[PDB]
Amino acid sequence: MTCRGHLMAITRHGVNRQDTGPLMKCSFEETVDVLMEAAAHGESDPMKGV
DNA sequence: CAAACACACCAAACACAAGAGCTAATTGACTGGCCGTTATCGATGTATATATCTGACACGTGCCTGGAGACTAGGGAGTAATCCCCTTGGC
Fold first, then answer.
1. What is the 3-state secondary structure (H, E, C) of A23-46?
2. A1 CA, B69 C1': Å apart
3. Whether the Cβ atoms of residue A46 and residue A21 lie closer than 8 Å to each other
């Protein structure tokens, strides 16, 4: 919770802000939203999360 | 006076609401126009059934011709005697 300096909330508003990966954010919450944002911005997933 | 940012407020959305597991029952589209098939109504017959009229056959009635009946008139056909002509017969 205190690795990025600011207090990341455990909610969708705090974990999805981290640059983990769209495939990991969509699992938790905000599926279509995070997927759409990644598609628009052309993000990349390193394929390292479980 | 006009533009910069900051704050408080108002107004507008997003996403979540544990893991699941079993069983039952309610919903099973619908008027209308139109084409395509087919059932029905209609004409245009030809075949068969029945009615009217004509033709041939049948039974019956009839008009007409010729035939038949009773009776009559009066004379044609016909007995009974006679003569003697003439035939058959003869030497």
1. HHHHHHCCHHHHHHHHHHHCCCCC
2. 179
3. yes
